[PDB]
Amino acid sequence: DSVPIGSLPPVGEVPNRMFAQVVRSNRLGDPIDAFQIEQVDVPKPGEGEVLVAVMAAGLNFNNVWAARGVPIDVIAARKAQGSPYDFHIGGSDASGIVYAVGAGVKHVQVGDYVVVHPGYWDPKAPDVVSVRDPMFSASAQIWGYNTNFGSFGQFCLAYEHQILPKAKHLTWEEAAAPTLVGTTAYRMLHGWTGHTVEKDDVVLVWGGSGGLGSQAIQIAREAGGIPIAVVSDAAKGEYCKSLGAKGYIDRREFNHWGQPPHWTDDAGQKVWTAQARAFGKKIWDILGERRNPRIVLEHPGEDTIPTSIFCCDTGGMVVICAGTTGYSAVVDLRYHWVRQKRLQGSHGTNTEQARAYNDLVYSGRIDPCLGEVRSFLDVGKAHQDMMEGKLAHGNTCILVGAAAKSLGKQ
């Protein structure tokens, strides 16, 4: 039989059923309405799979998208691919304890204390065991968003390659907080040959105090880069400085955000460029010298890309993993072509990148930036809070199998 939340059977004993915070197609909408607790069967691991008892789960805006069914209903998408399930168990971040392994799992063991990286693909696909990068495979996707059986169940299912050793000095909730956003940032900063962060490179980080940005600042700093954070208030600015940013830029000081004027609109271009230059000058002011960012860590998309493209150094890279302000990103070729800049899409993580990121966490070089811990019961409200901009600063987590806060250190 199932067990209560905040408890588990003996290690390696798996119940038939589990509790999960579930979405169904018939209740898509706001998170408060779309999420409901249900009991479902615990899945059995197949070849190469690992069943993890979730001790804590991290929250992400991807769960707001899955709850709303925008841009897609994930359930309907998987049904079109042959899935029998009519529910979605999200959650893309977890810490916990391995409770079962399938055939061919020769490294990970029952009882291991682990975290889960989000880079999901079929380990047995031809393109995965060959092509450039497993994240380019046909099967590549984000665990717990594109896949079912994520961290909002008492037990989650992942492939072996997603399993990482849990940092010993972190609690369950601390360890559950950063991996999705941290590995995403790590691939962005270290994954694109020709434009990886080097010592003394200036790195412009949008949304510096958010989950992605706070990991990016730390990763850049550990690489010997000089991070500059863009933020929405002074407190967030000082938070970013405390994580290693040399300084911050307050976005509210500018009003040019959005799609730029067409290149033929001379009057509009004059006004837009004066704003962009002023933004660039604040970078110079923080550095104490006229240097441009070699790497720009993007994610706002439509409203910021024009500034990113403009400020990026000659021969530099704007790398982007979302479009939170919209997807119609205008690239002015008079900057992008003549000064030979790179606009790089980046998504997920491969295993080498995830392990390298996790090694920084494990060694105590990176802070997981846990802001806020909620109960399993509050997944819907917590994502409602997220959508309404109301979460405390910091990555947010829920307890699942953990009986209380501040457990799990070794």
Residues that bind its own copies (CB under 8 A): 71, 131-133, 135-136, 192-194, 260, 262-264, 301-302, 305, 314-315, 320-323, 326-334, 336-347
Contacts of the segment 134-140: beta carbons below 8 A, 24+ positions apart:
134/350, 134/351, 135/187, 135/347, 135/348, 135/349, 135/350, 140/348
Q: By CB neighbour count within 10 A (0-12 exposed, 13-18 middle, 19+ buried), where does 196 fall?
A: middle
Residue 389's binding partner out of its own copies, Na ion, none, with CB under 5 to 8 Å set by partner kind: none
What gap in Å lies between CA 162 and CA 56, rounded to an integer? 16
Note whether 115 and 81 are within 8 A (CB): no
Q: What tokens appear for 309 in the block? A: 């493209």
Q: What is the residue-wise DSSP string for 348-364? A: S--HHHHHHHHHHHHTT
**CA 158, CA 117: separation in Å to the nearest integer?**
9
Q: Which is nearer to its own copies, 247 or 258 (CB)?
A: 258
Residue 394 CB, shortest distance to its own copies, in Å, is: 23
Taking Cα atoms as reference points, which of 168, 144, 185 lies closest to residue 58?
144
Identify which of residues 111 and 315 has a Cβ nearer to its own copies in the complex: 315
| β-pair partners for 155 | 53
Size of the site for Na ion (CB under 5 A): 7
322 binds, among its own copies, Na ion, none (CB under 5 to 8 A by kind): its own copies
Binding flags for Na ion, 141-180, as an x/- string (CB under 5 A): ---xx-----------------------------------
Binding window for Na ion (CB under 5 A); candidates: 31-39, 59-67, 94-102, 272-280 = 59-67
Instruction: Choose from its own copies, Na ion, none: what does 144 bind? Cβ within 5-8 Å by kind.
Output: Na ion
- Which window, 12-20, 137-145, 323-331, 369-377, contacts Na ion (CB under 5 A)? 137-145
Residues 216/188, Cβ–Cβ less than 8 Å: yes
Taking CB under 5 A as the binding criterion, the range among 95-103, 139-147, 274-282, 324-332 that sits at the site for Na ion is: 139-147
Would you say how long the chain is, in residues?
A: 410
Answer with the entry of Na ion, its own copies, none that 284 interacts with (C-beta below 5 to 8 A by kind): none
Q: Which does 145 bind (CB under 5 to 8 A by kind): Na ion, its own copies, none?
A: Na ion
Residue closer to its own copies (CB basis): 87 or 192: 192
Query: Shortest approach of its own copies to residue 131 CB, angstroms?
Result: 7
Q: Which residue number, 336 or 393, has a Cβ lying nearer to its own copies?
A: 336
Provide φ and ψ at 345, rounded to 5°.
-75, 145
Q: What's the DSSP call for residue 25?
A: G
Distance CA 355, CA 248 (A): 29
90 binds, among its own copies, Na ion, none (CB under 5 to 8 A by kind): Na ion
Breaks (C-N over 2.5 A) in the chain follow: none
Ordered DSSP codes for 166-223: PPTTS-HHHHHSSHHHHHHHHHHHHSSTTS---TT-EEEESSTTSHHHHHHHHHHHHT
The binder of 336, among its own copies, Na ion, none, by C-beta within 5 to 8 A per type, is its own copies
Using CA atoms, how far residue 2 sits from 46, 85, 103, 164, in Å, is 21, 20, 25, 27
| 167 contact, one of its own copies, Na ion, none, CB 5-8 Å limit per kind | none
Q: Which is nearer to Na ion, 338 or 403 (CB)?
A: 338
**Residue closer to Na ion (CB basis): 201 or 385:** 385
- Joined together, the tokens standing for residue 85 give 């399930």
Residue 208 interacts with Na ion (CB under 5 A): yes or no: no
92 binds Na ion, rule: CB under 5 A? yes
**Is there a contact between 75 and 8 (Cβ–Cβ < 8 Å)?**
no
Instruction: In angstroms, give the least distance from the CB of 150 to Na ion.
Output: 5
Residue closer to its own copies (CB basis): 4 or 326: 326
The reply on whether position 118 binds Na ion by CB under 5 A is no
Q: Which is nearer to its own copies, 32 or 287 (CB)?
A: 287
Which residues of the chain form contacts with Na ion (CB under 5 A)? 62-63, 90-92, 144-145
